[PDB]
Design a binder for these strands. Structure first.
Ligand SMILES: [Mg+2]
Ligand SMILES: [Mg+2]
Ligand SMILES: [Mg+2]
Ligand SMILES: [Mg+2]
Ligand SMILES: [Mg+2]
Ligand SMILES: [Mg+2]
Ligand SMILES: [Mg+2]
Ligand SMILES: [Mg+2]
Ligand SMILES: [Mg+2]
Ligand SMILES: [Mg+2]
Ligand SMILES: [Mg+2]
Ligand SMILES: [Mg+2]
Ligand SMILES: [Mg+2]
Ligand SMILES: [Mg+2]
Ligand SMILES: [Mg+2]
Ligand SMILES: [Mg+2]
Ligand SMILES: [Mg+2]
Ligand SMILES: [Mg+2]
Ligand SMILES: [Mg+2]
Ligand SMILES: [Mg+2]
Ligand SMILES: [Mg+2]
Ligand SMILES: [Mg+2]
Ligand SMILES: [Mg+2]
Ligand SMILES: [Mg+2]
Ligand SMILES: [Mg+2]
Ligand SMILES: [Zn+2]
Lengths: 135, 99, 213, 62, 22, 132
RNA sequence: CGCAAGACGGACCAGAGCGAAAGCAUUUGCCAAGAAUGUUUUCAUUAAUCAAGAACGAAAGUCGGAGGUUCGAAGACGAUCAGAUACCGUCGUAGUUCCGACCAUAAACGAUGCCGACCGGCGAUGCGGCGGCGUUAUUCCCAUGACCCGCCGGGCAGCUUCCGGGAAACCAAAGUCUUUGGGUUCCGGGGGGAGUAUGGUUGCAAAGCUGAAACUUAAAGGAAUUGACGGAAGGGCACCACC
RNA sequence: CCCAUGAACGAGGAAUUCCCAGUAAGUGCGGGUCAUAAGCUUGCGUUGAUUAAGUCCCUGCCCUUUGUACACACCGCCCGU
């Protein structure tokens, strides 16, 4: 069920970890990034908008993704981590670290980590007003 | 009564400073006035460092860092305890905290 | 309904001959049903490969974008598409008490490949410097920028894509620029930040093979 | 993972919401050269032996 | 009352007065 | 908490400064001495004062104490402080001297000094801490 | 993986620079400007401050065009609340962008007119010039750049000080003031009524400039000291706290 | 005092009290009240532990700096229809 690769060699795919403050996306796709293998989110595991971005939902999503990818023959993963970016926050949400550790403990081999978040040169106007959000 | 000689900003010799936005509340604050903090932090925290290093495919990969410049408006700086209020004499000290 | 991964066939991606490591990974694509062709959907794809994986003992903060142009027998034939610097390295050099100089050139190689090269350098602090800041004046900045522009133009326009990539692998252009601008203002972290492909000639097999060993 | 023991070498401090855990430094009985910080729940003193079922986490300093 | 809103109310009153003595 | 109050400490200090000769390292002799030379209306207070006197005797045994000031002890202390080496540390066969102080001495009319050895000056003018 | 449309020039970016002030940050070219420094050039009092009269003048707003990505007064909803015509969320008009005409107002602030002289120190920093060992580009030549140690001049500032002032906070100017006079412009005279009414004037309009009185009132106000309080930050304590 | 009768109650929801050693808790005994009288209280012994040797998390209460337009002192002061 996948490529024919010797025991010593590992098949590589990239994993996009979109860690917003509303939920977390774990999205494994090919090295080229065009064909996807498993994409499950934190909202697909917890039925409560509160916990959509919790570390627990990210852990469950990462475990599901790692299991499906192992069933599909990929043993090594390339991690690229993204925050919301744009004019909004640049710090990744709480689910990123939990998802990374979850897919590490799931037997997956770890490639090289990279931080790919949209960093505007000089963006448009941020959503909040001149006085900003007041809550 | 004047509280600070610099008026709480660093505008000397110029008329206008470009507005910037607070990373927390998205508030227009002059760049010189805003409280800026540069965060260099390991992408993987120390708790998951062992798990990441054990599950790696390379040797001595050295985990990447994350570099973020946070800009905070005075209200957010005080509320988030990034900056505190000090005594009338302790206000004059410009030395950064040891940390 | 039925799992689409059962109808998807795997393929192997090969790096051009300039890189020591040729095999770089695998790529899955659906089979050929009628109008849909596996090769057609397997062509316009870009791979982001670190130089540490393409070469043997090269620095890992450089990445190369490799794009495939032909497929023959479970093999993907890729050609150079661009070059970038990793985000961490790019963010690690921009410090607060030095001047950063940047330049770019739209220069084309002998083999019809129109490129755009970006170069970044940073002013260095002397070993005995007491002054906290190391800033270059505007005329010095413009001189350094002109030198960088002319060096990249000279290095690219006289060669072809293969030799350009061969010079880009160890960053000879950055070392040349650091050597050149030492008299104007010492530079500290000089690099070819980004290389992007603006235009390409028509696809020709013979040169591809050549490239692809 | 196996279960392994560790001898307490020095009591670091008190941690917890109500100061209920003693954060301590332990060196492993077999290796004798690798040591870590863990929080132990209960009265602890010099030289007593803690059995760690998990044996590679580190308690957060202070 | 805030001075700005007092001025605003005064301006509304002036506008009413000007519109009334057309 | 075994922290002594100022009553105990001042009483002990005065007793020691006045009757240092009669005292020693023994609590049970010190308490008798205190009850003989002083008027302490309580036995517990007497015991506390004697205990602190014993502690302070041990303290003065290995040096001085900021509270006590014994007139006879200061004479012996300055006798120890009267140490004199055989050869003065200022008597040197050869003393190094920079060219600048050599020129200053020449201007002083003391340029005929022989013990001076004109050492080479520094090269780099780097004597300031970098700023930042 | 590409294409497009508009906006914006992050990090570098500083108690740094420039401009009369509003204000000014991707590269390159062109255009005319400008301060300081340098100067054994030149004129020879040509100067300082300014009723009248002029140029510029953030944002918002008004007439026309063009464009309309993002944001977004108004508005329509969803929440929260006892109520919410708000704070939070969704959409979203005018506007936000460019050109051409109006508007001339800001906590347009250093809440401190401009010109000139005198009166303490110290270390930095930006520009220009003058010196000096010694390191770097280079490999050798003078160079000229990058540092290093000083000096001078004009700046943005900083620390310090029993200069002296001040109600004090504080100020090296807010000092050289009853030991009261260097020159000169604006302008204040208890608090409200009120920057209101009216007249004039400018403007398409919104509004701008000028600007009262009747009447009312013993205070309003400024700095600083103690308490009390706080939904501000830190510590400390207690089985009438907790574990 | 005697003989009869023989209810709920099968360990108690939200929420709370008091406790660090001869202690808590069981168990009686005295004093007071008292003509008649202790399920109360105040003392006394008797049997006799679990757990803790810590912390500001809750609850208070202290400080310290800071803000105030309060000073009858936030149960203050104060604004407009
Ligand atoms: Mg200026
Ligand atoms: Mg302004
Ligand atoms: Mg930029
Ligand atoms: Mg006028
Ligand atoms: Mg005008
Ligand atoms: Mg405007
Ligand atoms: Mg406008
Ligand atoms: Mg219009
Ligand atoms: Mg919107
Ligand atoms: Mg309503
Ligand atoms: Mg809204
Ligand atoms: Mg005005
Ligand atoms: Mg004014
Ligand atoms: Mg200079
Ligand atoms: Mg010189
Ligand atoms: Mg200077
Ligand atoms: Mg006068
Ligand atoms: Mg004037
Ligand atoms: Mg008046
Ligand atoms: Mg009129
Ligand atoms: Mg006027
Ligand atoms: Mg006051
Ligand atoms: Mg507490
Ligand atoms: Mg105040
Ligand atoms: Mg009062
Ligand atoms: Zn904020």
């Amino acid at each position: 069920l996948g490529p024919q690769v010797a025991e010593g060699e590992n098949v590589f795919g990239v994993c996009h970890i979109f860690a917003s403050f509303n939920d977390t996306f774990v999205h494994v796709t090919d090295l080229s990034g065009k064909e996807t293998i498993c994409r499950v989110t934190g909202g697909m595991k917890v039925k409560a908008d509160r916990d959509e971005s919790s570390p627990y939902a990210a852990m469950l999503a990462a475990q599901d993704v790692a299991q499906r990818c192992k069933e599909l023959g990929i043993t090594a993963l390339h991690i690229k981590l993204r925050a919301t970016g744009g004019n909004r926050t640049k710090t990744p949400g709480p689910g990123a670290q939990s998802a990374l550790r979850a897919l590490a403990r799931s037997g997956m081999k770890i490639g090289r980590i990279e931080d790919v978040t949209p960093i505007p040169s000089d963006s448009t106007r941020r959503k909040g007003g001149r006085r900003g959000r007041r809550l | 009564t004047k509280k600070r000689r610099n008026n709480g900003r660093a505008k000397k010799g110029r008329g206008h400073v470009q507005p910037i936005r607070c990373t927390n509340c998205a508030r227009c604050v002059p760049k010189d006035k805003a409280i800026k903090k540069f965060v260099i932090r390991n992408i993987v925290e120390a708790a998951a460092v062992r798990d990441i290093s054990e599950a790696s495919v390379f040797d001595a990969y050295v985990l990447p860092k994350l570099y973020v410049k946070l800009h905070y408006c005075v209200s957010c700086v005080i509320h988030s305890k990034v900056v505190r209020n000090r005594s009338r004499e302790a206000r004059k000290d410009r030395t950064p905290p040891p940390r | 309904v039925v799992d689409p991964f059962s109808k998807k066939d795997w393929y192997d991606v090969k790096a051009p001959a300039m890189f020591n490591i040729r095999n770089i990974g695998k790529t899955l694509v659906t089979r050929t049903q009628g109008t849909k062709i596996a090769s057609d959907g397997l062509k316009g794809r870009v791979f982001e490969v670190s130089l540490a994986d393409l070469q043997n003992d090269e620095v890992a903060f450089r990445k190369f974008k490799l794009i495939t142009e032909d497929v023959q027998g479970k093999n993907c034939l890729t050609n150079f598409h661009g070059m970038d610097l990793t985000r961490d390295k790019m963010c690690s050099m921009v410090k607060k008490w030095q001047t950063m100089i940047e330049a770019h050139v739209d220069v084309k190689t002998t083999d019809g490949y129109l490129l755009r090269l970006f170069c970044v350098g940073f002013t260095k602090k002397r070993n005995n410097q007491i002054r906290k800041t190391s800033y270059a004046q505007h005329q010095q900045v413009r001189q350094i920028r002109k030198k960088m522009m002319e060096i990249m133009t000279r290095e690219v326009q006289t060669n072809d894509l293969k030799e350009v990539v061969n010079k880009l692998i160890p960053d000879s252009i950055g070392k040349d620029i650091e050597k050149a601008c030492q008299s104007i203002y010492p530079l500290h972290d000089v690099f070819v930040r980004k290389v992007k492909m603006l235009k390409k000639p028509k696809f020709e097999l013979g040169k591809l093979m050549e490239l692809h060993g | 993972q196996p279960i392994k023991l560790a001898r307490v070498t020095k009591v670091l401090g008190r941690t917890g919401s109500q100061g209920q855990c003693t954060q301590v430094r332990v060196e492993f009985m077999d290796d004798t050269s690798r040591s870590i910080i863990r929080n132990v729940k209960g009265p602890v003193r010099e030289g007593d032996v803690l059995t760690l079922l998990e044996s590679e986490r580190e308690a957060r300093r202070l | 009352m805030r001075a700005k809103w007092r001025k605003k109310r005064m301006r509304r009153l002036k506008r009413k007065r000007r519109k009334m003595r057309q | 908490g075994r922290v002594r109050t100022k009553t105990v400490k001042k009483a002990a200090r005065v007793i020691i400064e006045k009757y240092y000769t009669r005292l020693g390292n023994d609590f049970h002799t010190n308490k008798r001495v205190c009850e003989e030379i002083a008027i302490i209306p309580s036995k517990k207070l007497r015991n506390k004062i004697a205990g602190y006197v014993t502690h302070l005797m041990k303290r003065i045994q290995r040096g001085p104490v900021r509270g006590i000031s014994i007139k006879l002890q200061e004479e012996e202390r300055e006798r120890r402080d009267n140490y004199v080496p055989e050869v003065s540390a200022l008597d040197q066969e050869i003393i190094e001297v920079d060219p600048d102080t050599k020129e200053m001495l020449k201007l002083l009319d003391f340029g005929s000094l022989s013990n001076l050895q004109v050492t080479q000056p520094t090269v780099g003018m780097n004597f300031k801490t970098p700023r930042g």
